[PDB]
Amino acid sequence: GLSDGEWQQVLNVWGKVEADIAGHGQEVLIRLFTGHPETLEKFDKFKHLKTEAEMKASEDLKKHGTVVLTALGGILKKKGHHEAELKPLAQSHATKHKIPIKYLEFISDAIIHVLHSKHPGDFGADAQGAMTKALELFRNDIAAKYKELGFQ
Numbered sequence: 001g002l003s004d005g006e007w008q009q010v011l012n013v014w015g016k017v018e019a020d021i022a023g024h025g026q027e028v029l030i031r032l033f034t035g036h037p038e039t040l041e042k043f044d045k046f047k048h049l050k051t052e053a054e055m056k057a058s059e060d061l062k063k064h065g066t067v068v069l070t071a072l073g074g075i076l077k078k079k080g081h082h083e084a085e086l087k088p089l090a091q092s093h094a095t096k097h098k099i100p101i102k103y104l105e106f107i108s109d110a111i112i113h114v115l116h117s118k119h120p121g122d123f124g125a126d127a128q129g130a131m132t133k134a135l136e137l138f139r140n141d142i143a144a145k146y147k148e149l150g151f152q
């Protein structure tokens with residue numbers, strides 16, 4: 001898994017997100033939707049967002065960004081002992097939302113991008129390495145549950 005030092009870096013980076021969780025969450029989703037428009041189609045309630053300006057102006061998009069990053073933050077704070085938090089999310093995303101594991105890769109990449117965009121020069125090589133490992137662990141544990149379910 002991750003070392004104690006690596007987890008410390010992850011949670012330090014997470015403090016930066018927590019200062020503006022809605023702002024980070026909004027930017028993560030906009031990065032996801034604009035880079036991969038197929039992802040928007042998974043959200044009946046964001047389908048109407050035909051432009052990035054409309055996305056930016058959407059308070060509901062921001063609200064969902066908050067929900068998403070709040071859940072992720074909870075999982076990260078468990079430092080890999082996250083089965084109870086992660087299993088239900090994996091199951092909802094496979095069975096109800098029908099989100100392929102590829103889209104979780106896309107959103108992981110979007111998180112890394114947004115961290116660099118909002119914290120340029122303040123999200124160093126060590127920090128990126130640690131956050132990347134944590135998001136890979138998250139994705140991998142979801143993928144294990146997806147396999148159980150035969151999803152995708």
Ligand code: HEM
Nearest residue numbers: 039042043045067068071072089092093097099103104107
């Ligand atoms: C960091 C990764 C993600 C986290 C932590 C996360 C978390 C959540 C949470 C907590 C909910 C509400 C509870 C639930 O339905 O399980 C939710 C809903 C949902 N998620 Fe995710 N999610 C992630 C990635 C994604 C991705 C990549 C997609 C699609 C590309 C997606 C699609 C959806 C949809 C369609 C809903 C229902 C939205 C609604 O209509 O209210 N999620 N997510």
